[PDB]
Structure 1
C-alpha cells in the first residue's frame, strides 16, 4: 500500500488537470456543492442543467508575480461570464446557481522563495477609494476574466486596492478565517478550493450578484535566485459544477 497525497487528478467533463505537488484540497465549510432541493425552491420555472457543457476547467489569463505585486482578485461567476456557453446561460437568464472548483497554479524550482494566499471570500463587497458615502460602480467590480489588479491606479467607480485592508476594511492577517490555502514554493505549487453555492436565498441573480470572490495575495515577497527572472506566472483555472439556470430570457444587457 503505497500512494501519495500530493499527486492529484481532477477530471471534469472533457478537461483534466494533473499535479504532483498539490496540497490537500479545501472543501469550503466541509460542504460539497449540491443541486437545489425542492424543499427550498421559491421560483416556479424548471431548472436546466448544462452538466457537461459548462462544468469544465476554464483557464484564465495568467498573471505575472513580481517582487512588488500586491495581489489579484476575481469575482465569480463574473470571472467566467465571457467563457463559452456558460456566459450565455448566465446572461440569457435572470438568475443562476452553480458551484466552483478553483485551481491556482504557480510552479517554481527549489531555489525560489515566496508564499501566495489563495482565499475565497464569500460576499466580498469592496470599499470605494473616495470615502465618505461614495459607492463602487458596477463597471469595475465586474471585470470578467480580467480580475482586479491591486497594484494598479484607481479609477472613478473602482474600489480601493489597498491589499492590506482586503479592499473592504479588514486586515490581511484575518482572511485565514475563510477557506484558503497557501502556495508555498518550497512545499506547494498548486492550490485547490472546492467552492459551493453560498447565499441567503435558494436562487439569486448571477449577473448583478457575485456569490464568492477569489483572491491571490502574495504574503511573502518573491525572492528569485541570483540571475533568475524576477517573475513567475500564476495561472488560475476555475471549473463550474452543479450548474443550474431558470427562466431563459432575452439576453441580459450589461454595459458595453
Structure 2
C-alpha cells in the first residue's frame, strides 16, 4: 500500500509528511555524503553539529497569484539566519552541505496551475544593465526573502526576466537541471535532495552560493469560480551532512 504518493522525511527533530508527492529527485543521482580524506585539503578537523543543523527550516511563505513571475532563493544564503546553522556559517572560515528541499502548494480538484521547481548549480546571474555591469553582493544575497522575479529592476541588482533564467538561457531548457513540477491536478509538493557540488572540496559559505532553488509558475494559476484568486507556496529546506571548518572570529558581511 506504499504509494509513490505518500512520504515521510524525518531529519533531526523535524518531520514532514506529504500525502500527494510525485516521487523525489536526487540530483545527478547522488545523495549528500561527508568529505572524504582522499579529497581533503585543509588540515583542520571539521565540526559536524549533526542534528542541531540538519533539521528542516521553513522559510516565510510566498503568494502565487495570476500575475506571479517566479521566485529565486540561493543556498546557503536562504538559511544564513536559521538557528545554529546560521551561526556556524558566520563563525567558520569554510563549511560544506547538501540539502533536502521540500516545496509545498495545495489547492483543490477544481484549480489548475503548474510550477517548475528546479535546482541550478552555480547560477551566475546577469546584470539588467548589459555590458559588464556587475550584480552587487546584497542583490545576490536576498536571505530568506529570496528574489521576486516580478519585482522591479533595481540598480546593482540582477535582471528578473523569466524567459531567460536570469542569465541568457531559455526557460524551456531548465529541465536539463534536477527539477520536479507541482501540477495542482497531480502533485502538491516537490522534493529534491541536493548533494554538495563544487570544484573545491569545501568553500566559503558567504562569498559563494552553490545552488539557486527556483520556483516558477508555468501554467498560470486558475482558480474555480469566485474562488480567491491566489494560493500560498511554502519552501522548507534542511541542511544535510553539514560540516564546518576553520573556526574563528565571525564574519562581517556587507549590508
SS of the residue corresponding to residue 100 of structure 1 reads: strand
TM-score by length of 2: 0.99
Structure 1 residue 226 displacement after superposition: 0.7
Structure 1 residue 93 displacement after superposition: 1.1
Q: Deviations over 1:107-164 (max 9, x none)?
A: 0100000000000000000000101110000011011001000000111111000011
Structure 1 residue 9 displacement after superposition: 0.2
CA distance in structure 2 between the aligned counterparts of 1:52 and 1:46, rounded to whole angstroms: 19
Structure 1 residue 4 displacement after superposition: 1.6
Unaligned runs of 5+ in 1: none
In the alignment, does 2:35 pair up with 1:36? yes
SS of the residue corresponding to residue 139 of structure 1 reads: helix
Unaligned runs of 5+ in 2: none
SS of the residue corresponding to residue 247 of structure 1 reads: strand
Structure 1 residue 77 displacement after superposition: 0.4
CA distance in structure 2 between the aligned counterparts of 1:132 and 1:4, rounded to whole angstroms: 51
Q: Assess if the C-alpha contact under 8 Å between 2:48 and 2:243 holds in 1.
A: yes
Structure 1 residue 255 displacement after superposition: 1.8
Structure 1 residue 57 displacement after superposition: 0.6
CA distance in structure 1 between the aligned counterparts of 2:254 and 2:3, rounded to whole angstroms: 48
CA distance in structure 1 between the aligned counterparts of 2:248 and 2:164, rounded to whole angstroms: 39
Q: Deviations over 1:202-228 (max 9, x none)?
A: 111111111111000111000101100
SS of the residue corresponding to residue 29 of structure 1 reads: helix
Structure 1 residue 25 displacement after superposition: 0.5
Structure 1 residue 3 displacement after superposition: 2.3
What is the match of residue 51 of structure 1?
A: 50
Q: Assess if the C-alpha contact under 8 Å between 2:137 and 2:254 holds in 1.
A: no
SS of the residue corresponding to residue 94 of structure 1 reads: strand
TM-score by length of 1: 0.99
Q: Deviations over 1:144-191 (max 9, x none)?
A: 001000000111111000011000111000000000000000000100
RMSD between aligned alpha carbons? 0.6
CA distance in structure 2 between the aligned counterparts of 1:141 and 1:16, rounded to whole angstroms: 30
Deviating beyond 2 angstroms after TM superposition, the runs of 4 or more aligned structure 1 residues are none
CA distance in structure 2 between the aligned counterparts of 1:233 and 1:248, rounded to whole angstroms: 39
Structure 1 residue 90 displacement after superposition: 0.5
Structure 1 residue 12 displacement after superposition: 0.3
Q: Deviations over 1:60-103 (max 9, x none)?
A: 01100000100000000000011111111011111110111000
Q: Deviations over 1:214-251 (max 9, x none)?
A: 00011100010110011100000000000000011111
